[PDB]
Amino acid sequence: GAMGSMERASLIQKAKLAEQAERYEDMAAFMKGAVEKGEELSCEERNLLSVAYKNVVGGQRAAWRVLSSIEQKSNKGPEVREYREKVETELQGVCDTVLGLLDSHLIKEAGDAESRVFYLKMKGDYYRYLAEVATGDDKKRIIDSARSAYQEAMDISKKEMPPTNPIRLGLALNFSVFHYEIANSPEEAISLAKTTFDEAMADLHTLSEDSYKDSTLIMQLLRDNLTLWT
Template sequence: LDQELTIEERNLLSVAYKNVIGARRASWRIVSSIEQKEEAKGNESQLGQIKAYRDKIEAELAKICEDILEVLDGHLIKSAESGESKVFYHKMKGDYHRYLAEFATGDKRAVSSDASLEAYKAASSIATVELPPTHPIRLGLALNFSVFYYEILNAPDKACQLAKQAFDDAIAELDTLSEESYKDSTLIMQLLRDNLTLWT
């Protein structure tokens, strides 16, 4: 694992983990929402079971995040050579610390949130230098980093500023859009715009 993955291998790894984590994040949201409703009703008898199930999902989420973060820190980030790979893996690191911060509380949440912020910042500083504003990985980073500001740091102004900047920068350089990434890039630009509409 200490040699650079091919683009295909990198994408397969990312999609595999995204699928595994995505299902559990969705379950966690549903169970948390049920828990809040039962709490509001004062339905004590159900709450124990619901909480136990939520704890089980959280343990699975934590394990998946810790596994991929270990691979990223132990191998992938170290062996990344191209600017694109470095951005990809730092962004991924930011994403999985963000997923930990979504359900963590207290000190654990603060630690995950800080680690996520650092990883996103590292990815951004490389992306700004190495990738054009229309590059799907740079746009995807801006999308996820802005969601982090909005959802985890409760900083809607910063989230909007980041998303708007990424969108405007990409629009200004639409002529650098490569044919093979046209669909990916324009889709992410649309998502950035959707979020801006939602957040303002």
Template sequence: MEKEREHLVYLARLAEQAERYDEMVEAMKKVAKLDVELTVEERNLVSVGYKNVIGARRASWRILSSIEQKEESKGNEQNVKRIKDYRQRVEDELAKICNDILSVIDNHLIPSSTSGESTVFYYKMKGDYYRYLAEFKSGEDRKDAADQSLKAYEAATMTATSELPPTHPIRLGLALNFSVFYYEILNSPERACHLAKQAFDEAIAELDSLNEDSYKDSTLIMQLLRDNLTLWTSDLPEEGGEQSKGDGVHAEKLRYCSSSVPPSYIPTGADYQECNNDIEEREPESIEHLLIETYRADIYKMCFNSVDEDVISSNNKAGFSFYWKAAEENVPNRLLKRGLRWMKRSILRVITMFFKAFKGCNNDKAPACL
């Protein structure tokens, strides 16, 4: 059995490198059916394989839905019917993939799990794939998928709270995706913001104890939590109207501008404008952070409602990851070498590439591109 397992894992690695994700999934599914506790690498191979397989279909579905909306607004009924038929084919593929991985999780991965970390990982995956079903289902089917997703996320959260530290990337990723579930599926921005902010604040409080091995992953997910909070807070009703924007908020803006550590305060575009006044006097890390944050926020505001952990996977090219695009273009390094003007031009070039690659978004009316 060990030789077979080693052979299948090696095939999965090869398939990943060749970007043949369907074959990667088939290999890792056979490993999962051996009913043994998977290693961290094997667990990640399962996740990455299915994430890429489902990601391509989710991207197709969002693009088709956006085109369908445009054709409906033009009154092109014949084209709308064609799109609906085509979209149904994509939905059938999505349902098949989701049901496939959910069966593997329930029948093999969770029963074979012995550690808190792997248990959280698999229940989080279960919540994610039921969430993907809820994205395109309707009526009772959507309600059932949403209920199952909620139960899985709650089970993962219960174990994560008792077994994993607040800075653990799996616990942070769970909070990120669970909050997206509340926002996108249950239409509850208040609950989504509360969950995301609580996870962010708890991680900030224990940032000093962060494991060096997971520092990059954890801080990246924390940035994504802040990105979502920046977007979602604009949907919440303001208490006290314009009167609430007084000296206290201004002091928070100044504190953000003068700090090299991201605070729990969620900055807005106006805050960034204030910070730009002294940008050239900042440390290099702060300049890079500020500009990347500003332009990434602009992208999300133009196109997305929220972003989940899928954007972190460098292999998930259908994941709409601005992080991935920026890294591929070596934007941070170039930013620091050239002046502020060149910095902005470089990031704008990446943004242009981004929108050329993914034309399906239609401003605020587009489905969230996860």
């Protein structure tokens, strides 16, 4: 692509600079370039990829929700619908780009549990974002694609990672949000969050101070959702 002439190391360095500059579109383009070099990503590089695209799609989703709300209230000419559609298409394009990176070829080359779970979680999340805007057709298949990705990630994480692992915790958080917000399965959402929280609590004693801080931070987010849901 357009980053084909830049060194991998330079792309990663520029992604870090773009993060500091709050230039997330640039950050995402740099990390896409890095992925397209064809090498596996390190832990830190996976995090950069994730931060970049979460910020890009986050802005798009926030805009979509503002516009969708205006459109619903109005139900005046075609403009709100047209502009909501424009933002929607752009969002779908970003999701498709991320999903394309995961399929070509990040997931298939990810053999370690940490990397494979991370990428399958991402796959679940980006199908989830597609589901948020999907209507009528393919919507069921999109939801099932999210579910299938999260489920594979869960199965690996349960076998290969401690219950306090931040990736495992974040996966559970997001899969529980999927159940609550997308799958109309609030009880599954609550069960998953509660079991995840309790199993993590019981393993905190094994952790260093730094690991403890990370795990308990995510546990508090699980608890926050349980509070909102009950």
